[PDB]
Design a protein around this ligand. Structure first.
Ligand SMILES: Nc1ncnc2c1ncn2[C@@H]1O[C@H](COP(=O)(O)OP(=O)(O)OP(=O)(O)O)[C@@H](O)[C@H]1O
Ligand SMILES: Nc1ncnc2c1ncn2[C@@H]1O[C@H](COP(=O)(O)OP(=O)(O)O)[C@@H](O)[C@H]1O
Ligand SMILES: Nc1ncnc2c1ncn2[C@@H]1O[C@H](COP(=O)(O)OP(=O)(O)O)[C@@H](O)[C@H]1O
Ligand SMILES: [Mg+2]
Ligand SMILES: [Mg+2]
Lengths: 173, 512, 49, 460, 49, 343, 73, 146, 118
C-alpha cells in the first residue's frame, strides 16, 4: 500500500488544477490513467526494469487523451521515481482533496430496505446540520440490518440497526 | 438458588434498564496484526495514550500516531483479532479505578477484578501516566515504616515516603521480605499495595493465601500481571499500582507499594519497544529505560500539608500524605554494576542488598551490612531503635572482615577473640522465621540484650531458644512497658533501668 | 454442598425453560418501537428448548 | 476449495495472498501441495492488505509462486488421549514409527490459555524418585518443575530415562516426552530402551528433530504440553519430560530472526521471556489433576548468566546441578550435592528428619572439602582423630549417593536398583552416626540400599 | 470451606444466567426477524432521523 | 494566528506541518493547546515539504493529530537579572515555587554562540574561595571549570552552600544553581537548607529533575547558563553550579535516540563532544566579567575512559575529590588532598 | 514505500514544464536541515568538493551528488 | 544440522529395502568429522555454539598444550564423547577407565604442582603418575597404532 | 599480473607486497557505497572472496615459481580481527611480530610461540 507516496502527487496535481480552472478535467484524466494501470499486460510492463524514460514513453503512448501539462509531465515525474503503480491512490486522494475544498461530504447510508425519500431528505438536511457541508447520500440495501439504518460519515458512524441493538443488549447481559 | 425468580428478576432488570437509543462514535479498521501490535486505519481524533476498544471487551493503547495509521498494543489475547475488524475510540486517556472500595481485592492492570467476588466500588478514575509532586510540594521523610525484621529495622530504617531498593540474586528472600513488610502493615495506618510483574500464577496464589491467612489482605490491594500475560499488561502495571497508591497519598494518608521485579517490567518494555522498531541502547533496552523507572519511582513521595490541603480543596487540613515504594531488582551473580541495577540504584535512596552466600548458610534474612544503606537514615528511625542500633551495622561489617581473616589465623589475640565472638552472636541473633513479624518493643529489648552483654554466658548456643523465651517472659510480666514502648517509642534513663531489671530477672530465674 | 447445589441447579433449569419463553418476548418487545406480533409463538417454542 | 496464492518464498518463510474478505487469522494452519507431498504453513503475521506471512512446517524446497493455498480454519491440531500412548509423532501429530495411522477419537489445537491463579491447587505431595541423591538433596512436589542443569556429556538424558522408567513401573502413572531439538541417534536409543524395558506402553513420544525447520522445532513443546493437558483433564497425575529447553530458546531465536524482528541483548529474540512464560505457565497442578515436569537445561560455555538459563531459572522449583568432574571420577549420577537446591527443602514440608539428614550430609561434605587441602599438604597422619573420622565418613557418603540405573546397564552390565526414600534416609542417617565405620569405602560404591552395602562388605 | 462453596454457587448461578441470556437473545432475534412490518421499520427510522 | 498542524506523535517526538514558506527555523519554539494546558515544542530538524520535527517540553499525552500549532518566531526565552534571585524556575522560565510571579524586566534566548576570540579576557587570574584546602591544593581559575567527585554524606551540599555564601559576601557576585536530572527530594531539602541559612537571597535556582520529560532535562542547563550570562554582562563574577553534568549527557543521548540517529562509540549520541563543548565553551572569563563553574561529575562503572568522563575531563580545569575517610576523621571539609588536582 | 525528497510544490514545478533545466543550472533551494547537514535541490552544475554559497556569508561543501539532490555540510 | 544429521548408522531392513534386495543383514554407516576454527579459544561464538550443540561430541585442541609439546594437543576432560565405550573394543574399554581416573585426579591435584615439594608423598605419587600418563599419550604424526 | 607474466615465461620470480592489508581496507572503504550490507566488524561481506581471488593466483606452477613475502598489518594489534584471521590460512610460513617483545628492544621482534612453518 502506498497512500503515503501518493499524497504529494495528489496534492501537487490538485493545487495545480485550481491554478488552471480544470479540476474536472484532471479528475477524469487521472481516472483514465488509473484504469490503464490495472491492465494485466501493462502491469507486467511496469514491473519490468526498463529505463524510467522509455517506460514513461511506453506509458504515454497508450493514453493520447491527455494534456501536455498532465500526462506528459505527471506521468514522467512519477516514472522517474517509479511511482506509477500509485496512480489508483493518487486518484482517490485527489478526489478527497477536492471534496475538502468544495465543502462536501460523501455520507453513506445503509438499510434493510429503501427509504421513503422523505426520510432520506430529512437525513440529508440533518447531516448537513450535524456537519458543515453539502452531503451526497448514497444508500445500500444490506439485509443483515433487518431494520433501521447505519449512517457513516467518514470515521463517524451512527448505528440504529436492530442487529446492533440486539448484540449490544446481548452484551448488557 | 431454588428461587429462579431471582434469575428471572435479574434478567428482567437488565432488559428494563437497557438503553435503546444510540450515539455517534469514531471508528477505524484493523489493517495489520502481529506479535501483539496492531495498526489501525482511521481514528482521525485518536489521541496519544488513548484507550481504543476492541471487539471482545478489551482495549489497546494508542502509542504511535503516525501520519496515516495508529500503532496500538493490545492489552490481552490478540491472536483472535484479524484485518478488517472495526475498533472504536473511547474519549479516555488510560484510566484505572481508585479508592477505598478496591482495598483488599485482587485486580489486573486495567483494574478489572480477577478475584471472582464481583465488581469494584471505586470513586472516580485516575490517569495512569501522571506527574509527580514538584520540588516545593514535598516534605522531609521523618516518620518510620516498620518492616518487622530485626535486621532491617535496626540497621536499615525505612521512612514514610522513602524509596528503598530490595536488590539481590535470584531466590534470596526478596518476595518474602516484601510480603512480610506488607503483613506487618496490618494494624498501622499504612495501606499496602502489591504489584506482581511477570510472576508465575502459583506464586500469586501462595501470596494471596498468606495475605488472607495472616489477616493482612483486608488492608491491601493486589495488582496482577502474570508471566503469561501480554507484555503491554506487564509494562503498564506498576503505573496502575502507583496511581492506586497515589490516590491515598493525595488524601493525606499513608500508603506503601511493592513493585515485584521492575527488571521484568524493563524486559517487557524492551519487548514492546523493539516490536515498534524503536532504536535500542546499551543492552538493547530502549534509550529511555531510565525515564521508565525514574518517572515511576519519583511518584513515591511525602507531600506537605499545603499540597494535600490545596488538592483536596480544603477538606483536609493537618495531614501530610506519603507513598513508600519498595522496588525489587534481580541481579545476576551479584554484579551490582549491571545496567538496570545501577540505574535503579541511582534513582532510589538506599538498597537492601541480599547476599546469596549468606542465604545459603542459613542466615535468613540475608541482608549484607556495609554495602546496604539508608540515606534517609536515623531521621525516620524511632528514638529507642536509634539509640540501641547505632553500633550494630559497623560492628557486623568489621566482624565479617575479621572472621574472614580468622580462617588463616588460628591461635589469635584474645582481644579480637571477643569481638569475633560478639559479632558471631549478633549475626546469629538477627535471623528469624518466614512469617514472624516482630514489634518495635520485641526488637528493642532483644537488641538491648545483645548490646548490653546479657548474651555473653548464653553466647554458647541455643540463642534462638533464649530469644523466644525472653519474648514470652516479657510478654507475661511487663506488658505495660511493652505498651509504653509500642505507643511512644521513647527512651529514657528510667526505661534503661527498667530494661536492666527485666534482663536481670530473666537471666536469674528462667531457662531456654 | 456439591450434591446440594447440583440438585438445586437441576431444579432451577426446568423452571428457567419456562422463564426463557417470557424473556425472549421481553427482549424482542423492548427494542422495536411498535410491539411484537401476537400468536407468533410457534417459532419461539421451536427455539425454547 | 482453495483461495490463497503464494506470492513469496524466502527460505522457510512464505507469503500468501488472500481475498480481502477471507484473510486467515494468526496461528491458523494453511495447507499447500508441495508437489505430491502435503505442506502446512502456520500464519505468523497479518502484514498489509490481504497478504499473510507464514512459516513452513515441512521443508520449503520445491515451492513456487502462484501455488494454491487452502486455509484450514483451525490452528495446528493434534490427536490426544490413550490412543497416543506408545506411538511416535511429529509436531503435526502424524505418525513416524510406521505402525500405520494413530486411530484417533478427538483432536485439540496446540494453542490455548493457561489456568488462572484461582484454579491452581496448592499441593506439597513429594514425588518419590528411585534416585538417592535426588530424593535426598532436591525433593520436589507434584505440579513442580525440575531443571537438570549441566554441561554436555554429564547425564541429563540418561537421568531422564531413569526417571521415566522409575515413574512408569514403580508408580504406574502415565508420562509424556517432548523431544524438542532431538538428535535422531538419541531418539532411536530412547525408543529402543523404552521398548526393551516394557515401559513404552505408558509413554507418549513427540519428536522434533534437529534437521527440521525452526518453527517445526519450536511448536513441539506445545504439542507435548497439549497431550499432557489432555491426560490431566482425565484426572491423572501426568509427568512431562522436555529434553532440552536451550534448544527451544534457540528455535525461538531462529524463527524470530527469520521474521526479521529486531534482535535483543545477546541476539536472542525480543519475546524470549514471553515464550518461556507461555510454555512454563501451562505446566501446573490444578484442582482436577496435575502435570509435573522435568526439563534438561544445557548451560552454554559454563555460565548461568546468559539469557536462556537466566530466564528459565525464574520458573523452576528444583534445580539439580550435574558436573563432568564428578562424572569423570566415575560416580553416577553426577549430581553435585552442594550446589543443587529446592524450594521445598525445609522442615515444614519434608519433616525434621529428612531436613536434618540433608543438612548433615551437606555439612559433612563441606568439612571434607575444607580438610582436603590440609590432607594434601600435611598428609593424613597429621589430622586430629575426630577429623580422621569426618574424612572417612564423608568419603563413604560420597560413595553411597552413587547408584546403578536400570537404563545404564547397557553401559555397565550391572543391574539397576530402586531405593525408597525411607531406605535413603536410613542409610545416610546411619553412616553419619558411625554405625558403619567398620565397612570399607568400596562397600558403598554403586550399591542400592544399605543392606547391599553390608552384604558387599561381607562379600568383599 | 464455606467461602469456597459460596464461590462455586456464584459460578453455577452465573453459568446458568449466561446460558439463558444466550438462548433468550437468539430467541428475541428470530422473533424480531419474523415479527416485523414496514410501518414499524419506518417508525424506527423516523425515531433515528 | 496559528498556522501549523500536528501530523505525527510518537512518544515525545512531534511532527508538525507548516506552509511551504512559513517553515520555522531550527531552534524556534512552537506551542499547542493540549486540552487546557499549553505545551511548548522545541524544533530539532527541518524535513522536506514543510514538515518540522520537534521535541515536546512537557507531557505528550492527549495530543491529537491535526491540532493547531502556533509558531513563536524566537527560541525559548527565559527571564533574567536580579528578579530571579531566590526563586525556583523550570526550563521554560516559569515559577515552580509558589511565591507568585517573576517581575523580570528582560528575557533572553537560551541559545547563543560562545564569546568570540577577541572578546575573551587577555589575562589569567585566581578565584579566592576562602577555603584552605581548595585554595591551597586545588586553586580556582576565575572562569575555569571544577569537578566534584565525592559521593553522599561527605558534605557536598555544605561545600556548595559555603561557596555560594563566600562568592557573594567577600566578592560581590551572585550564583546560579542548575539541577539537571537529580532527585526531587534533594532539591526540596536543598532549598530548605539554603533558606535556613540566609543564602537563598543570593542564588537563583533552576530545576529539571528525573521525573521530567527528556527535553526539560536537556535544556535546563542552558536556562541556568543564560541566567549566569545575564549576570556576567552586568560586570559581575558569577558561580554556576551544575548538579550533575553526566545527566545532561545522558538526556542528550535519550533525545538523540528519539530522533533516530545512529549510535556512537559506546551507544552515546554521535554529537556528544559537540553537545558538551557547546555548553562548556560559554563558561569563560570575558573582559566584562566572568562565570566560574562547579560541576558534580559521575563516572559510569568507575571508568575514567568512558566517553562521557573522557569528554568532560577535557574541559575541567580543577578537580576536587571528597572522601568519606576524611569525614570519619571528623575533618570538614572532607577534601582528599592527595587526589584533589588543579592544572 | 518511502518518499525520496520529492515534495508537493517541486512536483508542481515539474508539472508546469518537465524540462525545468531550461532554468539556470547555477542555483538551487535548500530542502532540509538537520544537525549541520543540508540537502539541496537543483544545482545541476554542482561538482563534488565545490563551495556552495548560502544566504548571509556562509559556505557548504558538496559531499554527495545524488540522483536529484546535493548533500552538503 | 540438516547436513550433519545425514551422518547415520542405518539398520539392515532399511538397506534391504533401499537396494530392493541384493543386500541383507548388513548395516550402513556414514561417519562425519566436521572441523571448526575458534578465535582465541572462545566457544561462545555463533557457529561454534551451533555445531557444539548439534554433534555427539567434541575434541578440543588447545594451543597452550600444543606449544608445550603435547601433540596431539587433545584436552581431556574438557572434551566429550557421548558414545563412550559402546564404540570400543572390550580391551580398550577395560583399560581406559584407569586412564580417565588418573587424569581426573591429576587435574584436581594439578594446582599444587607449582609447589611440588611442599606436598605429601601420597598426593605426590598421584601427581607424578598423572604426568607420566600425559607424557605417554604424546604421539608422532603419520604413525597410526594398531 | 607482472609477476604472473614472469612466471609464465618459465622463470622463477620474487614478489614482495609491502602491505596486503591495504587492499582489503580499500575494499572496505568502497564497500558501503556500493550498497552492500555490512558484515562482522564493518568489513565487506565479500572479504574472504576478495582476499582469496588475489591470494590464490600468487602461486608456483609446473612452468615457473613465485617466491613471495607479504607484510600483513594487524589492526589494533588484534590477531583475531577478521582480516588477519582470514589471511592466516593462505600463507605457508607465518612470522608473527609482537609489540611486547619490541618494547624490550629485542629486534627481530618475532614471537616464537606463534610463528610456524609448513
Ligand atoms: N526468613 C526465612 N526463613 C526461612 N525460609 C525463607 C526465609 N525467607 C525466604 N525463605 C524461603 O526461601 C525461598 C525463596 O524465597 P523467595 O521466594 O522470597 O525468594 P525470591 O528471591 O523472591 O525468589 P525469586 O528471586 O526466584 O523470585 C522460599 O522457599 C522461602 O520460603
Ligand atoms: N549412570 C550412568 N552409567 C553409565 N554411563 C553413563 C551414566 N550417565 C551417563 N553416562 C554416559 O554419558 C553418556 C552421555 O550421557 P547423556 O545423558 O547423553 O549426557 P547429556 O546430558 O550431555 O545428554 C552416555 O553415553 C553414557 O555412556
Ligand atoms: N563544614 C562542616 N562542619 C561541620 N560539619 C559538617 C561540615 N560539612 C559537613 N558536615 C557534616 O556532614 C554531614 C553530611 O550531610 P549532607 O551535607 O546532607 O551530605 P550530602 O550533602 O552529601 O548528602 C552534615 O549534615 C554535617 O553533619
Ligand atoms: Mg521471588
Ligand atoms: Mg543431552
Amino acid at each position: 500500500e502506498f497512500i503515503t507516496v501518493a499524497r504529494p502527487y495528489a496534492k501537487a496535481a490538485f493545487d495545480f488544477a485550481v491554478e488552471h480552472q480544470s479540476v474536472e478535467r484532471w479528475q477524469d484524466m487521472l481516472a483514465f490513467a488509473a484504469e490503464v494501470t490495472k491492465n494485466e499486460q501493462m502491469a507486467e510492463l511496469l514491473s519490468g526494469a526498463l529505463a524510467p524514460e522509455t517506460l514513461a514513453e511506453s506509458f504515454i503512448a497508450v493514453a493520447g487523451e491527455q494534456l501536455d501539462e498532465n500526462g506528459q509531465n505527471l506521468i514522467r515525474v512519477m516514472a522517474e521515481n517509479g511511482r506509477l503503480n500509485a496512480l489508483p491512490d493518487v486518484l482517490e486522494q485527489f478526489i478527497h482533496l477536492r471534496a475538502v475544498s468544495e465543502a462536501t461530504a460523501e455520507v453513506d447510508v445503509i438499510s434493510a430496505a429503501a427509504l421513503s425519500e422523505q426520510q432520506l431528505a430529512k437525513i440529508s438536511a440533518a447531516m448537513e446540520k450535524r456537519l458543515s457541508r453539502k452531503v451526497k447520500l448514497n444508500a445500500k440495501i444490506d439485509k443483515s440490518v433487518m431494520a433501521g439504518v447505519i449512517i457513516r460519515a467518514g470515521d463517524m458512524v451512527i448505528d440504529g440497526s436492530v442487529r446492533g441493538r440486539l448484540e449490544r443488549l446481548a452484551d448488557v447481559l | 438458588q431454588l428461587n429462579s425468580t431471582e434469575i428471572s428478576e435479574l434478567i428482567k432488570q437488565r432488559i428494563a434498564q437497557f438503553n435503546v437509543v444510540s450515539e455517534a462514535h469514531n471508528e477505524g479498521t484493523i489493517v495489520s496484526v502481529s506479535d501483539g501490535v496492531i495498526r489501525i486505519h482511521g481514528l482521525a481524533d485518536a489521541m496519544q495514550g488513548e484507550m481504543i476498544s476492541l471487539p471482545g471487551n478489551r482495549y489497546a493503547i494508542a502509542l504511535n500516531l503516525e501520519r496515516d495509521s495508529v500503532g496500538a498494543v493490545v492489552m490481552g489475547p490478540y491472536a483472535d483479532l484479524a484485518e478488517g475488524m472495526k475498533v472504536k475510540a473511547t474519549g479516555r486517556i488510560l484510566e484505572v479505578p481508585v479508592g477505598r472500595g478496591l482495598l483488599g481485592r485482587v485486580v489486573n492492570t486495567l483494574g478489572a477484578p480477577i478475584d471472582g467476588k464481583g465488581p469494584l466500588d471505586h470513586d472516580g478514575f485516575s490517569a495512569v501516566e501522571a506527574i509527580a509532586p514538584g520540588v516545593i510540594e514535598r516534605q522531609s521523610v521523618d516518620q518510620p515504616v516498620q518492616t518487622g525484621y530485626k535486621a532491617v529495622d535496626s540497621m536499615i530504617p525505612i521512612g514514610r515516603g522513602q524509596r528503598e531498593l530490595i536488590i539481590g540474586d535470584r531466590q534470596t528472600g526478596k518476595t518474602a521480605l516484601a510480603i512480610d513488610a506488607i503483613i506487618n502493615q496490618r494494624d498501622s495506618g499504612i495501606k499496602a499495595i502489591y504489584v506482581a510483574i511477570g510472576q508465575k500464577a502459583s506464586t500469586i496464589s501462595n501470596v494471596v493465601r498468606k495475605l488472607e491467612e495472616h489477616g493482612a489482605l483486608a488492608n491491601t490491594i493486589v495488582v496482577v500481571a502474570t508471566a503469561s500475560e501480554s507484555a503491554a499488561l506487564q509494562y503498564l502495571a506498576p503505573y496502575a499500582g502507583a496511581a492506586m497508591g497515589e490516590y491515598f497519598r493525595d488524601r493525606g494518608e499513608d500508603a506503601l507499594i511493592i513493585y515485584d521485579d521492575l527488571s521484568k517490567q524493563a524486559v517487557a518494555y524492551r519487548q514492546i519497544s523493539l516490536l515498534l522498531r524503536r532504536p535500542p541502547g546499551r543492552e538493547a533496552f530502549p534509550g529511555d529505560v531510565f525515564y521508565l523507572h525514574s518517572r515511576l519511582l519519583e511518584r513515591a513521595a511525602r507531600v506537605n500539608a499545603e499540597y494535600v490541603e490545596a488538592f483536596t480543596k480544603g477538606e483536609v487540613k493537618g495531614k501530610t500524605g506519603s507513598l513508600t515504594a519498595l522496588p525489587i531488582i534481580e541481579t545476576q551473580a551479584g554484579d551490582v554494576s549491571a545496567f538496570v541495577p545501577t540505574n535503579v540504584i541511582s534513582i532510589t535512596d538506599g538498597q537492601i542488598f541480599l547476599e546469596t552466600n549468606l542465604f545459603n548458610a542459613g542466615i535468613r534474612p540475608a541482608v549484607n551490612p556495609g554495602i546496604s544503606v539508608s540515606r534517609v537514615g536515623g531521621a525516620a528511625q524511632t528514638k529507642i531503635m536509634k539509640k540501641l542500633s547505632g553500633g550494630i551495622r559497623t560492628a557486623l561489617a568489621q566482624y565479617r572482615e575479621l572472621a574472614a581473616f580468622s580462617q588463616f589465623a588460628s591461635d589469635l589475640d584474645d582481644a579480637t577473640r571477643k569481638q569475633l565472638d560478639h559479632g558471631q552472636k549478633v549475626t546469629e541473633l538477627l535471623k528469624q522465621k518466614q512469617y514472624a513479624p516482630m514489634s518495635v518493643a520485641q526488637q528493642s529489648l532483644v537488641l538491648f540484650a545483645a548490646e548490653r552483654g546479657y548474651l555473653a554466658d548464653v553466647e554458647l548456643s541455643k540463642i534462638g531458644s533464649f530469644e523466644a523465651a525472653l519474648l514470652a517472659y516479657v510478654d507475661r510480666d511487663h506488658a505495660p512497658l511493652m505498651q509504653e514502648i509500642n505507643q511512644t517509642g521513647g527512651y529514657n534513663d528510667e526505661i534503661e533501668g527498667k530494661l536492666k531489671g527485666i534482663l536481670d530477672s530473666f537471666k536469674a530465674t528462667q531457662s531456654w | 454442598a456439591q450434591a446440594e447445589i447440583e440438585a438445586e441447579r437441576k431444579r432451577a433449569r426446568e423452571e428457567l425453560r419456562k422463564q426463557v419463553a417470557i424473556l425472549a418476548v421481553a427482549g424482542a418487545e423492548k427494542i422495536i418501537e411498535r410491539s411484537v406480533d401476537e400468536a407468533a409463538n410457534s417459532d419461539i417454542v421451536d427455539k425454547l428448548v | 476449495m482453495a483461495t490463497g496464492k503464494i506470492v513469496q518464498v524466502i527460505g522457510a518463510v512464505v507469503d500468501v495472498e488472500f481475498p480481502q474478505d477471507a484473510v486467515p487469522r494468526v496461528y491458523d494452519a494453511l495447507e499447500v501441495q508441495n508437489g505430491n507431498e502435503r505442506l502446512v504453513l502456520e500464519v505468523q503475521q497479518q502484514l498489509g492488505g490481504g497478504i499473510v506471512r507464514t512459516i513452513a512446517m515441512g521443508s520449503s524446497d520445491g515451492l513456487r509462486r502462484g501455488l494454491d493455498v487452502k486455509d484450514l480454519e483451525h490452528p495446528i491440531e493434534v490427536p490426544v488421549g490413550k490412543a497416543t500412548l506408545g506411538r511416535i509423532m511429529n509436531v503435526l501429530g502424524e505418525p513416524v514409527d510406521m505402525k500405520g495411522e494413530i486411530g484417533e477419537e478427538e483432536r485439540w489445537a496446540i494453542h490455548r490459555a493457561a489456568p488462572s491463579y484461582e484454579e491452581l491447587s496448592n499441593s506439597q505431595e513429594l514425588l518419590e524418585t528411585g534416585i538417592k541423591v535426588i530424593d535426598l538433596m532436591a525433593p520436589f512436589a507434584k505440579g513442580g518443575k525440575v531443571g537438570l542443569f549441566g554441561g554436555a556429556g554429564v547425564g541429563k538424558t540418561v537421568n531422564m530415562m531413569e526417571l521415566i522408567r522409575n515413574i512408569a513401573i514403580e508408580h504406574s502413572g502415565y508420562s509424556v516426552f517432548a523431544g524438542v531439538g532431538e538428535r535422531t541417534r538419541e531418539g532411536n536409543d530412547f525408543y529402543h530402551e523404552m521398548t526393551d524395558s516394557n515401559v513404552i506402553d505408558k509413554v507418549s513420544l513427540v519428536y522434533g528433530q534437529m534437521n527440521e525447520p525452526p518453527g517445526n522445532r519450536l511448536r513441539v513443546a506445545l504439542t507435548g504440553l497439549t497431550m499432557a493437558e489432555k491426560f490431566r483433564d482425565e484426572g491423572r497425575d501426568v509427568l512431562l519430560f522436555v529434553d532440552n529447553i536451550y534448544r527451544y530458546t534457540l528455535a525461538g531465536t531462529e524463527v524470530s530472526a527469520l521474521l526479521g524482528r529486531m534482535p535483543s541483548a545477546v541476539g536472542y529474540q525480543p519475546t524470549l521471556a514471553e515464550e518461556m512464560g507461555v510454555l512454563q505457565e501451562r505446566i501446573t497442578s490444578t484442582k482436577t489433576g496435575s502435570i509435573t515436569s522435568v526439563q534438561a537445561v544445557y548451560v552454554p560455555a559454563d555460565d548461568l548468566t546468559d539469557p536462556s538459563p537466566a530466564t528459565t531459572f525464574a520458573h523452576l522449583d528444583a534445580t539439580v546441578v550435574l558436573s563432568r568432574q564428578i562424572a569423570s571420577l566415575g560416580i553416577y549420577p553426577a549430581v553435585d550435592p552442594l550446589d543443587s537446591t529446592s524450594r521445598q527443602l525445609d522442615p515444614l514440608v519434608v519433616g525434621q528428619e529428612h531436613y536434618d539428614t540433608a543438612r548433615g550430609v551437606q555439612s559433612i561434605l563441606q568439612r571434607y572439602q575444607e580438610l582436603k587441602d590440609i590432607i594434601a599438604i600435611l598428609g593424613m597422619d597429621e589430622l586430629s582423630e575426630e577429623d580422621k573420622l569426618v574424612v572417612a565418613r564423608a568419603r563413604k557418603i560420597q560413595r553411597f549417593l552413587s547408584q546403578p540405573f536400570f537404563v545404564a546397564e547397557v553401559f555397565t552390565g550391572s543391574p539397576g536398583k530402586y531405593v525408597s526414600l525411607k531406605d535413603t534416609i536410613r542409610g545416610f542417617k546411619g553412616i553419619m552416626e558411625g554405625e558403619y565405620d567398620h565397612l570399607p569405602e568400596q562397600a558403598f560404591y554403586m550399591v542400592g540400599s544399605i543392606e547391599e552395602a553390608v552384604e558387599k562388605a561381607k562379600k568383599l
